[PDB]
C-alpha cells in the first residue's frame, strides 16, 4: 500500500508516470468480445492479452508499476490462470508492483445509477480482491476517469468505503479553465450536508489531459508516436529532442498544481495489448530525463 511507495526526490519537480488501461466493460462490443478479443474489426481490443503482457512486463523490470481497474475482466482472467501464475501475481501485488485502482466490478456511471446498486457493484469487486489478495490488494483511491460528470453522492459513497482519494477526467470545460488559472485543480470534496466531517470528505484531483498521454508520448501499439531512439550514429536519433520536449512539458504542467508533484496518465482505451511497446520506451524515457 503506502508502505510500498517509490522514492520521491525532494526539492525537485516530480512527475509520477501512471501506466494504465481503461477497459470498458462493454461499449462498442460485448464483455466477452472485449475479454477474448473477438471482432477486432469493430474495435481492436482483447483484455486477456493485456493482462498477460502487463504481468510479463512487470517481471521484466521491478521498477515498473501498473494499476488495473475493472474487476469484472480481471476476475475472469484470474480463474483462467494456473496456480503457478496466481502465486507469482500475488507477490507482485504484495510488493505493490501491481495495484488496484477503483476495485468495483466495473467503473460505474454517476448520473443514472441508484446509490444502492452502486454499492452492490462495488462490494462485488472489492469482495473478489479482498479474498484473493487480502489487505494488499485493496484500492486506496477511486478511479473515475471517464464518467460524464460527477455526483456528490458518489463522493459520499467512496468516502464511506474508506477511500483516501478520488481522481477524474471529465469536468465542464469552463470549470477546468478557471481551475487551472486559479491553481485549484485539487481540493477536498464535502459530499454530505448530513454526515459529520471527515466522514464524507473525499480528496479530489482533476487530471491533466483527461486520461491520455501527453501529445507525442503515446507508445501503445495503437498510437504511432515516434519511439525512443538512442543510437547516436543513427539518423532516426531523437533522444535529445525528446528530453528537451519533456522537460518543457513537465515544468509547464507543474505550474498548474500546488505541490512539487504531478501525474501523467500513460495509457488509454484498451492499451497495453502488447505491454512491452509501452514499458521499453518509458524505461529509457525515465533514464534519459533523470540523467
Amino acid at each position: 500500500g503506502y508502505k510500498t511507495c517509490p522514492k520521491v526526490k525532494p526539492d525537485m519537480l516530480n512527475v509520477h508516470l501512471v501506466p494504465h488501461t481503461h477497459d470498458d466493460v462493454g461499449w462498442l462490443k460485448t464483455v466477452d468480445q472485449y475479454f477474448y478479443g473477438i471482432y477486432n474489426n469493430i474495435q481492436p481490443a482483447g483484455v486477456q492479452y493485456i493482462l498477460d503482457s502487463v504481468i510479463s512486463s512487470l517481471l521484466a523490470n521491478p521498477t515498473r508499476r501498473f494499476i488495473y481497474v475493472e474487476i469484472a475482466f480481471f476476475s475472469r482472467w484470474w480463474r483462467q490462470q494456473t496456480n503457478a501464475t496466481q502465486k507469482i501475481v500475488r507477490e507482485l501485488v504484495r510488493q505493490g508492483r501491481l495495484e488496484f485502482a477503483n476495485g468495483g466490478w466495473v467503473m460505474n456511471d454517476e448520473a443514472t445509477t441508484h446509490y444502492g446498486a452502486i454499492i452492490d457493484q462495488m462490494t462485488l469487486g472489492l469482495r473478489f480482491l479482498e479474498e484473493t489478495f487480502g489487505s494488499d490488494g485493496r484500492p486506496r483511491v477511486a478511479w473515475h476517469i471517464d464518467p460524464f460528470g460527477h455526483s456528490r453522492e458518489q463522493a459520499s459513497l467512496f468516502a464511506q468505503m474508506g477511500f483516501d482519494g478520488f481522481f477524474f477526467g471529465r469536468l465542464d470545460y469552463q470549470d477546468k479553465k478557471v481551475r487551472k488559472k486559479t491553481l485549484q485543480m485539487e481540493q477536498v470534496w464535502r459530499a454530505s450536508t448530513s454526515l459529520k466531517p471527515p466522514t464524507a470528505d473525499l480528496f479530489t484531483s482533476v487530471l491533466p489531459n483527461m486520461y491520455n498521454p501527453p501529445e507525442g508520448l503515446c507508445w501503445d501499439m495503437l498510437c504511432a508516436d515516434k519511439p525512443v531512439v538512442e543510437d547516436t550514429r543513427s539518423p532516426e536519433y531523437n533522444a535529445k529532442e525528446l528530453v528537451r520536449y519533456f522537460l518543457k512539458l513537465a515544468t509547464d504542467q507543474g505550474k498548474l498544481y500546488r505541490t512539487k508533484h504531478t501525474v501523467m496518465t500513460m495509457g488509454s482505451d484498451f492499451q497495453y495489448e502488447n505491454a512491452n511497446t509501452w514499458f521499453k520506451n518509458l524505461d529509457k524515457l525515465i533514464q534519459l530525463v533523470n540523467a
Partner: protein, 150 residues
C-alpha cells in the same frame, strides 16, 4: 437456486456505457440478455425459499409481463393463489392488479375471510384486471386465494 448470476449482471449494467445507454445496440441487447438469464436462478431460489417458509405444496410461477397486462395463469386458471412479498421494514397495504378473463372473482385473505375485489376493464384493449388490497408484513409475505365464481 442461485442469486449470484443476477447480482453480477446488475453490476455489469452499472458500467458507464450500459445503463447510461451509451453503448451500441448489440451491446444494449446483450446487457438485457445477461439480466434475463440472472432472473431464472433467482426465482428458483425464491421458490425454495417460500416453499420452505410456507410449506405450501404447489409449484409457484412468476408473471414477468404484468408490465403490459399479460399473465397466462391469471387469465386461465379458475383457482389460484397470490403470494405478495414485501421487502420494506414496515407493513404494506398494496394494490394487486392481475389480468383475468371476463368473469367474477372471489378473494379470500390469509385468514380465509372474503376481501373486497373488483374486475376492472382496460380501455380500448377490452381486456380486464382483478384488483384487491394486499396487507403485507415487513420483510414478510401474505397469501390470498382467488376463485372465479360460476
Amino acid at each position: 437456486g442461485d442469486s449470484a448470476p443476477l447480482n453480477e449482471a446488475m453490476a455489469v449494467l452499472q458500467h458507464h456505457d450500459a445503463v447510461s445507454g451509451t453503448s451500441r445496440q448489440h451491446v444494449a441487447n446483450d446487457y438485457a440478455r445477461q439480466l434475463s438469464e440472472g432472473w431464472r436462478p433467482c426465482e428458483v431460489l425464491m421458490s425454495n425459499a417460500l416453499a420452505h417458509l410456507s410449506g405450501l405444496k404447489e409449484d409457484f410461477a412468476f408473471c414477468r409481463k404484468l408490465n403490459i397486462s399479460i399473465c397466462p395463469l391469471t387469465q386461465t386458471a379458475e383457482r389460484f393463489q397470490v403470494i405478495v412479498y414485501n421487502p420494506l421494514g414496515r407493513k404494506v397495504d398494496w394494490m394487486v392488479r392481475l389480468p383475468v378473463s371476463k368473469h367474477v372473482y372471489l378473494v379470500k385473505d390469509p385468514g380465509g375471510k372474503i376481501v373486497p375485489s373488483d374486475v376492472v376493464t382496460i380501455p380500448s384493449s377490452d381486456s380486464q384486471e382483478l384488483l384487491f388490497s394486499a396487507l403485507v408484513p415487513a420483510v414478510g409475505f401474505s397469501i390470498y386465494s382467488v376463485s372465479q365464481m360460476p
